[PDB]
C-alpha cells in the first residue's frame, strides 16, 4: 500500500494546538497523517522527510 519510509499513514481530523514530528512547527489545516505504530502526526508535506518506522518507534521508546 504505502511504506514511503516504512509505515502506514491514514487521515485524521486534527484540532487545537499541534506540531509536526519533523518540522516542529504548527499545522494549520484540518488534515494530518498518523502511523498507529509510531504514534506521530505530520503536515502531509513532510511524509518522505521522516526516518523509517523502526527508527522512529525505537526513538519514541526512550
Amino acid at each position: 500500500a504505502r511504506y514511503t519510509n516504512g509505515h502506514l499513514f491514514t487521515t485524521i481530523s486534527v484540532s487545537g494546538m499541534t506540531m509536526c514530528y519533523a518540522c516542529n512547527k504548527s499545522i494549520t489545516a484540518k488534515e494530518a497523517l498518523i502511523c498507529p505504530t509510531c504514534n506521530v502526526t505530520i503536515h502531509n508535506r513532510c511524509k518522505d522527510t521522516l526516518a523509517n518506522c523502526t527508527k522512529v518507534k525505537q526513538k519514541q521508546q526512550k
Partner: protein, 430 residues
Amino acid sequence: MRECISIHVGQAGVQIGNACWELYCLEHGIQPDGQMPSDDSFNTFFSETGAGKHVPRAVFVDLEPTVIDEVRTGTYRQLFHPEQLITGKEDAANNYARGHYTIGKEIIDLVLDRIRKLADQCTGLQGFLVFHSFGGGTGSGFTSLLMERLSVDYGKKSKLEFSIYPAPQVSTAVVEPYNSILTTHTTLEHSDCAFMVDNEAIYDICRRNLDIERPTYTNLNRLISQIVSSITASLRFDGALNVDLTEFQTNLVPYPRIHFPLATYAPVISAEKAYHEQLSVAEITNACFEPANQMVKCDPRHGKYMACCLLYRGDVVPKDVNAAIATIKTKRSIQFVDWCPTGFKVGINYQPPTVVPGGDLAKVQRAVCMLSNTTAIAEAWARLDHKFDLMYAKRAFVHWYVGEGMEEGEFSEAREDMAALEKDYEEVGV
C-alpha cells in the same frame, strides 16, 4: 411480484431501517401511517391490504426493547404490523456469544416464523436485505444465528447485506474486533454480496461536501438509505437498463468468496453549493472514483478495481454514461485487473432522487451510485485483524465469551478464516 424481505437487527440496523422506510414512504407517496392518497411500483417493499393500507415487508428484531419501543411510539407506529416488531428481554451487552448461543437462541423461532409468514405472501420473492452492525453484540450474534437458518430454509434466494464496519480511529466499543472476526464466518459462508460501510468516511464526507461541521447518526442514516434506495430503484421503477437483483450479483462477484464490494453515492452536495455548478453526467461519474467520496476509509489507489456497477438514476442519457466511462478508462490512476477487460456494469433508471424534506442533501436531477469490488478493501481488514492479534495474545476479554457457552477455539478458527480471506484478495490481485 419481485418482492424483497428487509430484516433489521441491532440498534444500528433498526435505526437505518427507520431512515430507510422513511425514505421509501416519501418515494412512493405513502403516508407515514400507511395509507396512500390519490401502478404496483410499491409491490416490491409494501404488501397491500383491502382497507387501502400498505404494510411494509419488514421485520425489526432487537434483544433489548428500547429502540423498538421507540419505533412503536414514534410517528411510524401505525406503519408496521405489530407482531413483526419483535423484542426480547435482555440486552446482548456487546457479546457475540450471548447473541448467538444463549439469549438470541430463544427469540429465533418467532423471527423465522414471521419471515415465513412474510414469504408466503410473496409470488416472486427475490432475496433478503439484512441490515446490521459488525461491532454490535446482537448485530453479530443474531445475524449469524439467523443467517445459518435462512441459508438452509430459503437457500436459493439471494441475500444482500448492509453492514457498518469498524473504523481506523473512530470506535465505540472495545471488543469490536472480536465481534467482527466472529461475524466473518457468516459473511463468508452464508452470504452472496455484503456492503461494508464506515462511520468515519461518511463523517469526513459530510464535513467536506455537505458543509455541516457536526452531524448526528441521522445524517449517516439518511445517506445509507439513499444508497439502498438507489440499489432497489431498478426493481421498483422502469428504466433504460433495469438491473435484476441476481444479475447484480453475477456482475459483482468474480469468485465464490470475493463478495465484499465498496459502495458510494454522488452527488453528495449541500443545497447552497448546488446552485453554482452544473452536475453533468461526466462530473458525477468522475466524483465516484475520487478517494474523497468512498464510504470506507481505504485508498482505492492502493488496490485494483475488479468490478464496478454504476447505477444511474434520474435524467441520465446513455451517451453520457458511455462518454464518462471512456474518460474513466483513459485515466492511469484508476487501475483495473488484467483479467476483467469489460469492467463496468451500467444500469439507468428514470426516477430522480427524492429529498427528505427535513434533510440536508440537495435536490438534483441526476444521481449515480457506484459499487466497486476492489482489492483495496483488503487493507481495511489488515487493519482490524491486527487489532485482534494484540488482544487475544493476552487472552484479554475472553472470559466473558467463554463464560456464555462459547468455545475458545472458535477464536483461533475465526482468525484463521480471515487469514484465508485477506490472502485471497491479494492472491487475485496478481
